[PDB]
Amino acid sequence: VILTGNSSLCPISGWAIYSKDNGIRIGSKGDVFVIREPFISCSHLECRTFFLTQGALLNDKHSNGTVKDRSPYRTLMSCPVGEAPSPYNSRFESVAWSASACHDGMGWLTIGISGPDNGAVAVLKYNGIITDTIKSWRNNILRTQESECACVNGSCFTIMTDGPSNGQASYKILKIEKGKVTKSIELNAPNYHYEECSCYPDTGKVMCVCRDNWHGSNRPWVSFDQNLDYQIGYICSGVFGDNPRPNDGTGSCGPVSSNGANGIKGFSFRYDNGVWIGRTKSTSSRSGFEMIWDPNGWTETDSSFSVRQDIVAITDWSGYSGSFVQHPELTGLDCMRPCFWVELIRGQPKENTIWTSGSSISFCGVNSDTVGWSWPDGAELPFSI
Amino acid sequence: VILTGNSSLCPISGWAIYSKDNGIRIGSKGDVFVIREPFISCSHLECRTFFLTQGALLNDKHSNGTVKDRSPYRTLMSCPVGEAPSPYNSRFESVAWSASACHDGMGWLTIGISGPDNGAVAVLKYNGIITDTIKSWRNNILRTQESECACVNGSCFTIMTDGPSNGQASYKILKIEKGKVTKSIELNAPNYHYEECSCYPDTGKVMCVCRDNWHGSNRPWVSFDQNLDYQIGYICSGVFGDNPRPNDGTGSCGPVSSNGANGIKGFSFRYDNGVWIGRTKSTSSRSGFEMIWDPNGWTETDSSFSVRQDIVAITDWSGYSGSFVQHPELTGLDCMRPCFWVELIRGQPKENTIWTSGSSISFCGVNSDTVGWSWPDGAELPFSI
Amino acid sequence: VILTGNSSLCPISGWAIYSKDNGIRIGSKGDVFVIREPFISCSHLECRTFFLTQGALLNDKHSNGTVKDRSPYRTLMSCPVGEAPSPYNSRFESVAWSASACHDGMGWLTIGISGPDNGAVAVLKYNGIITDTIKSWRNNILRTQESECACVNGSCFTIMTDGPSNGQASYKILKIEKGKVTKSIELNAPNYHYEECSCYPDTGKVMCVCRDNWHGSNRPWVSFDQNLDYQIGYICSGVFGDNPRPNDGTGSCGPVSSNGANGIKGFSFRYDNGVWIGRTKSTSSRSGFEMIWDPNGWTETDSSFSVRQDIVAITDWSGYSGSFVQHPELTGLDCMRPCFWVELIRGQPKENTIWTSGSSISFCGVNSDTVGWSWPDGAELPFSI
Amino acid sequence: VILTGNSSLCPISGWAIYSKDNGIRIGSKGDVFVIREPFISCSHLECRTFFLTQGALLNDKHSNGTVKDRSPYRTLMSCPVGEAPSPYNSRFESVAWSASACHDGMGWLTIGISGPDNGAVAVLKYNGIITDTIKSWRNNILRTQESECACVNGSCFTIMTDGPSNGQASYKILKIEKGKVTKSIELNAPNYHYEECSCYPDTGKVMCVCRDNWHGSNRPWVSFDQNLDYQIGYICSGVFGDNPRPNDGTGSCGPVSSNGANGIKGFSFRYDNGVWIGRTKSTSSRSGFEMIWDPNGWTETDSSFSVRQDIVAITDWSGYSGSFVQHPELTGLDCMRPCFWVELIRGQPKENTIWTSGSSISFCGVNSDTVGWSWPDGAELPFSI
Ligand SMILES: *[C@@H]1O[C@H](CO)[C@@H](O)[C@H](O[C@@H]2O[C@@H](C)[C@@H](O)[C@@H](O)[C@@H]2O)[C@H]1NC(C)=O
Numbered sequence A, B, C, D: 001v002i003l004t005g006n007s008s009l010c011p012i013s014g015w016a017i018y019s020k021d022n023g024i025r026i027g028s029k030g031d032v033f034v035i036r037e038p039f040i041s042c043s044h045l046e047c048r049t050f051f052l053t054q055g056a057l058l059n060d061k062h063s064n065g066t067v068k069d070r071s072p073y074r075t076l077m078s079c080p081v082g083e084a085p086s087p088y089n090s091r092f093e094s095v096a097w098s099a100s101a102c103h104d105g106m107g108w109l110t111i112g113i114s115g116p117d118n119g120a121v122a123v124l125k126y127n128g129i130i131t132d133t134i135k136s137w138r139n140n141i142l143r144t145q146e147s148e149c150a151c152v153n154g155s156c157f158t159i160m161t162d163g164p165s166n167g168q169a170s171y172k173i174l175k176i177e178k179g180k181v182t183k184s185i186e187l188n189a190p191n192y193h194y195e196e197c198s199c200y201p202d203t204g205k206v207m208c209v210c211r212d213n214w215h216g217s218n219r220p221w222v223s224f225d226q227n228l229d230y231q232i233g234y235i236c237s238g239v240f241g242d243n244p245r246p247n248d249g250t251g252s253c254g255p256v257s258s259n260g261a262n263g264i265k266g267f268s269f270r271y272d273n274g275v276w277i278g279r280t281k282s283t284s285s286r287s288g289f290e291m292i293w294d295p296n297g298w299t300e301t302d303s304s305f306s307v308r309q310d311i312v313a314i315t316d317w318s319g320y321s322g323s324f325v326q327h328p329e330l331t332g333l334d335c336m337r338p339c340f341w342v343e344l345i346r347g348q349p350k351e352n353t354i355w356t357s358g359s360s361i362s363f364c365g366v367n368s369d370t371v372g373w374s375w376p377d378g379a380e381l382p383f384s385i
């Protein structure tokens, strides 16, 4: 089976809860990795949670300093969806402080970036065997999606960035076939900033919705065909998607400068000229989560929208979010099912612990009845250590 | 293989012990979930224990407050029969504070209800993929079996309730095929109350024995064919099945009002006009367990019975109980084998720990020699936390 | 595949070490069951360690009182050979304070006895499904091998005892086919005492070597064909096999009364008129272990022997031992391979802990070079609890 | 599938990071074996880490004294590559204080040496069944590779040593088919010393690079064909490979006596007359690790080399290292892929803890971009115990 990736997104009305791992609550007692940057990806047979460990467990002195993003100890590992990530249930994937993974219908591609900030190297594996490497081309923190790559017709596609986090950087699309890079192109995107892209397949092409850490509080997007012919823009809705951001107002199809510096990984799904936006509830901190349906928000700049569905209350911590899909080959449906996950970050810098970790929740789009609620992390901090 | 469900219940003389997980005893030291509402269900290949976690482990501060029935942290998970439920041996099924599950011979159906009390949503999954949702229709704690659904001829069947726990509510039978609701019907049952049904297949139809929390100390039942043509009644025996209940006396084929409010999940198996009743030994607390064979107790109101088999002594805590079956496709027999499980609740509200959890035992009906004994939880409370 | 059981024992010169689980050393820190009565049994594909848990882990207060033999919490479980028995790696088999198990080439038979001392019941399972029960016929601690049953030509065979531990009791051979008892016979053995038989297949028949707890310091044996036509005797060698026992001297083909009361489970392998005897090194305590080849010891009463191979030094604790075989279907050999295990008992009554448990070692017979040594338990008692 | 072993080593430019288990960091809180002497070996389907436990876990009193090399508690076990070695994820292989293992395309061979120093016995298993034994022929610590054996065309090959660690000893090549020794030959190697060989297949033959503990600070090598026709020598490069060693200088094709006593297990890969040398960074302690490409270093004695790639900084502890290969049957390539692992030793004798253990990293050779860095153990000693 190679996944064809030729179907369009399923029609949906809302989001049904799919998983909740309670990883941090469980890790108070059990042997659970300190992690961050979790994401879900599926094959034609099953779904897995990928994550970047800190090479350490919760409620242990080695969790000290784990707010830090990059180290030689961080590893990409995976476990079944909805299970707490433990050394006893997790598969080792790669040594990595930035990662992506996806399944083409025949095997798992994993991409794990490690090494020094001035010369990092991405190691590509297919079926767990090294198949390629990509070295930093700007010598400034080579980095990738922290969510699943997108597979169409036997090729998989990702985005990598190298360069400043606070100014113009360099962005490339990669086409990968059985773990080997077969094509790449650099985005000609002066005045754009792309990080941590959430990319999905749709009708034989790929759409990515990303993070502008330089000067945009709306999200940049890039779409492309299998030949890497691409288009770029920003989501136009005045329902701004990044964190931090301004209050909702008049949007732009270029970067919205107000509160544009810094950011958070996120995602959106385009339906025609409309968009499903996942975002924090706070404009200033990584708190709460909600899904908003804006029926003209892909291309129009008003702040009007039609549906809001609560996911995490504003009084609870949230974190990264990302898209994942379930292909027809897995579901038996005739359309591409859209899903998403949310990372619930606990500890530093917002809480007075020695450590930082995240738990996860996930949802899938359905055309049937759903409900808003809050499904927060629920851990009681600090722990014994 | 779809399970035919066309066989009748095996002839039996008593109950042989099948499993004991010692979960709470083990959780004094190991990494074991805080749970409640466990149940067993089987495929044509194996048997599994399902349970509602509290998103926390025993002997940890996150076990605090786990007497509480519903939260966003509760998840439906499963592990092999007889094993302690741990994050290291348990599969994630759904986010849920009320659940059911069953296997049609081809795949697992799980039903997990989460969300707010005034608008809960049941998420149905088949082979782990969301296939349907059902929203609360009375906006008052949508809830289901907390035991296995029943499968006959490629369709599976369950009961859901919505409305008051202390007055007339609404009860629906659902027919589900590959995880999609294909038919439903509301019971016309004024003056009845149905919760937490224990439902089994028998001769191409389904029988459910349930809990009347409003005003019955005997148990209500509902039977139906594959078209959802149904019959309703209460078990007539004066050997009253609920907890609490009066002393044994003259029964009724409608609800016995004496000590009828409140209740406990339980089960019974009909054989002709007779009945095997599983019940607590105490009339006032969730203590002890016994099986009673009353050869005319399905339809006649006397308090006489023929056989009593001890399962848990009255000096030890019991809890919920439920039916499960082993189909011919699993056992190789020419009849449907009846079995049952018992939840052994420890902690709150009867013990003044910070937590509540349960362990489990199970038995299967045999036409061979058996013995009464007591197989209680055996944990020594409190733990370290 | 049904195992034919038609081959004869392989020629051997000594014993090569096969496994060591270090269970108690590991259980000082890790989550390891308190156990006793471990044994190994194999299929045509793999070997497993079976054991009777105490429903509790080491280094925990529930290990208190575990010198006690029988309780409702004890369960028969299994794990891979050489692994520490944990809730995270062990399969649940049956509720049991006495047990046997074996594989016929198509599936696992397990026999688990639980219930009260005056009316215990053995539950037989095949492929994990209950297939028969056997109730106590003397109402005095129905009990079985605590080692593997023997399979020949699609039937499996075991021995059960009911009656006094210090006087004449009742002994039956059982023939079991796909978990159903198809034949049984009571041994006509006045003045014999049979407990805890170690039984192996050989040339289409079965040989069992057992424990006389009444009045023999040599071991009783019983051999039989597939029709349960049997012969009985005691091992004649003056190299006495039980513990306690006298110093080596003149043996008997009936029970040797000197130091005959009490005993230990053990085994021996007959080769022609010779015997391989496994025994403790101490005559008075369960200490040390050795294998002795006595080339005429099956039928002759002298105390001469030709080979001794050290297994555990006399300064270290030993415990039960038992035979297991590896059939041609597993090994590819043209003969039946003899193997044995030893239980290394720690704690009560010899050591001042609240608990009793055992670890295990095992060996297989080879016709190649071997060496004597000591492979003791190695745990440092007491633990924190 | 038998692995042909007929391909030559892949062309490479450097080493891409393959795994990092963080075992000791994880064992600060989790249940992780005390180990040493880890090594990786692969089949046509997967890669596994093998290791010698001390029959004890980290952060527990039974870790006391584990600097000691040989005991009856040490066992050869295996787990998936990159996972912490735990009793909950590790398969038991053999009882062993010296070992090797490898897969011939059809099944796993394991070799585990246990017993006394004056008469140790190697137990050979194929698919987990004992297939042969080899006894000590010099009665002085029979010992083997502590890394994978090499398989070519259905036979597997290893080196064993018996005799002094500080003078002339005896060295044998063994040929093994389905776990049975089918041929052996003693090396005629007066004035050489061979221990702990790292052996790989290349073009239908085997090359081993070993440790001279007697009087060489360069490494000895032995190559042979399937008939065990052999050649011997020492690596000629003045880039000395052992630890301890003198500063780089003029090499020798025989043993370099300067600082020749003592040593460390290591490896090298021959390409034409050149060599890839893995070595510690320190000349005096087991600190740091680097890969050096010396394009004439197999046969020429100068100290010039072309490429140095950092692996572990000199400020951090390293340890043993060894070769492993990935065959074409696993990778789908047309050449034999060279890889290596490094053991990162913590505790005694360099740190004053009660215990000694190791974690591991591994790399594979690629003809694509790579980078030098440091991926050290990272644990913060001491632990709680
Ligand atoms: C333990 O559970 C109980 C309910 O059984 C909670 O009330 C406790 O919550 C704590 O105390 C209350 C009064 C309130 O201050 C709340 O915010 C606290 O969290 C709970 N204990 C803890 C420590 O969470």
Ligand SMILES: *[C@@H]1O[C@H](CO)[C@@H](O)[C@H](O[C@@H]2O[C@@H](C)[C@@H](O)[C@@H](O)[C@@H]2O)[C@H]1NC(C)=O
Pocket (backbone or CB within 6 Å): C380, D064, D065
């Ligand atoms: C810890 O290991 C050391 C070796 O590194 C042992 O000597 C200790 O053994 C104990 O002390 C010695 C002197 C002797 O009394 C012995 O019998 C003791 O066991 C060991 N410590 C412990 C507690 O086993």
Ligand SMILES: CC(=O)N[C@H]1[C@H]([C@H](O)[C@H](O)CO)OC(C(=O)O)=C[C@@H]1NC(=N)N
Pocket (backbone or CB within 6 Å): A037, A052, A069, A070, A097, A098, A141, A142, A143, A146, A164, A165, A195, A196, A213, A263, A264
């Ligand atoms: C590679 C790397 O360190 N990426 C960072 C990321 C990054 O700093 C910003 O996008 C700015 O470039 O931000 C964050 C973040 O929480 O904002 C986490 C990521 N951490 C990890 N992936 N480890």
Ligand SMILES: CC(=O)N[C@H]1[C@H]([C@H](O)[C@H](O)CO)OC(C(=O)O)=C[C@@H]1NC(=N)N
Pocket (backbone or CB within 6 Å): B037, B052, B069, B070, B097, B098, B141, B142, B143, B146, B164, B165, B195, B196, B213, B263, B264
């Ligand atoms: C959905 C829900 O909360 N169901 C309750 C159930 C319920 O309160 C009564 O049946 C009255 O309606 O009672 C009990 C109970 O122990 O009596 C446990 C259940 N808990 C859980 N399933 N979580």
Ligand SMILES: CC(=O)N[C@H]1[C@H]([C@H](O)[C@H](O)CO)OC(C(=O)O)=C[C@@H]1NC(=N)N
Pocket (backbone or CB within 6 Å): C037, C052, C069, C070, C097, C098, C141, C142, C143, C146, C164, C165, C195, C196, C213, C263, C264
């Ligand atoms: C069924 C039962 O309790 N069997 C006992 C056994 C028995 O007491 C003697 O054989 C005398 O009959 O002795 C021992 C023993 O250590 O001697 C352990 C066994 N314990 C267990 N199998 N649980």
Ligand SMILES: CC(=O)N[C@H]1[C@H]([C@H](O)[C@H](O)CO)OC(C(=O)O)=C[C@@H]1NC(=N)N
Pocket (backbone or CB within 6 Å): D037, D052, D069, D070, D097, D098, D141, D142, D143, D146, D164, D165, D195, D196, D213, D263, D264
């Ligand atoms: C069999 C044995 O004990 N081998 C030793 C090895 C050996 O002492 C030297 O090579 C000298 O002969 O050295 C070392 C070592 O760290 O140098 C570890 C090995 N330990 C183990 N394999 N257990």
Ligand SMILES: *[C@@H]1O[C@H](CO)[C@@H](O)[C@H](O)[C@H]1NC(C)=O
Pocket (backbone or CB within 6 Å): A064, A065
């Ligand atoms: C914990 O981490 C902080 C931040 O890097 C460091 O400065 C501090 O020394 C650490 N504490 C210990 C005991 O290692």
Ligand SMILES: *[C@@H]1O[C@H](CO)[C@@H](O)[C@H](O)[C@H]1NC(C)=O
Pocket (backbone or CB within 6 Å): C064, C065
């Ligand atoms: C431990 O077991 C003994 C022996 O049965 C018992 O008498 C004692 O009370 C126990 N201790 C505790 C605290 O349960």
Ligand SMILES: [Ca+2]
Pocket (backbone or CB within 6 Å): A211, A212, A213, A214, A215, A216, A217, A218, A242, A243, A244, A259, A260, A261, A262, A263, A264
């Ligand atoms: Ca921004």
Ligand SMILES: [Ca+2]
Pocket (backbone or CB within 6 Å): A237, A294, A295, A296, A297, A300, A302, A303, A304, A305
């Ligand atoms: Ca709009």
Ligand SMILES: [Ca+2]
Pocket (backbone or CB within 6 Å): B211, B212, B213, B214, B215, B216, B217, B218, B242, B243, B244, B259, B260, B261, B262, B263, B264
């Ligand atoms: Ca009631």
Ligand SMILES: [Ca+2]
Pocket (backbone or CB within 6 Å): B237, B294, B295, B296, B297, B300, B302, B303, B304, B305
């Ligand atoms: Ca009656």
Ligand SMILES: [Ca+2]
Pocket (backbone or CB within 6 Å): C211, C212, C213, C214, C215, C216, C217, C218, C242, C243, C244, C259, C260, C261, C262, C263, C264
């Ligand atoms: Ca005796």
Ligand SMILES: [Ca+2]
Pocket (backbone or CB within 6 Å): C237, C294, C295, C296, C297, C300, C302, C303, C304, C305
């Ligand atoms: Ca003799």
Ligand SMILES: [Ca+2]
Pocket (backbone or CB within 6 Å): none
């Ligand atoms: Ca623990």
Ligand SMILES: [Ca+2]
Pocket (backbone or CB within 6 Å): D211, D212, D213, D214, D215, D216, D217, D218, D242, D243, D244, D259, D260, D261, D262, D263, D264
């Ligand atoms: Ca040397």
Ligand SMILES: [Ca+2]
Pocket (backbone or CB within 6 Å): D237, D294, D295, D296, D297, D300, D302, D303, D304, D305
């Ligand atoms: Ca050179």
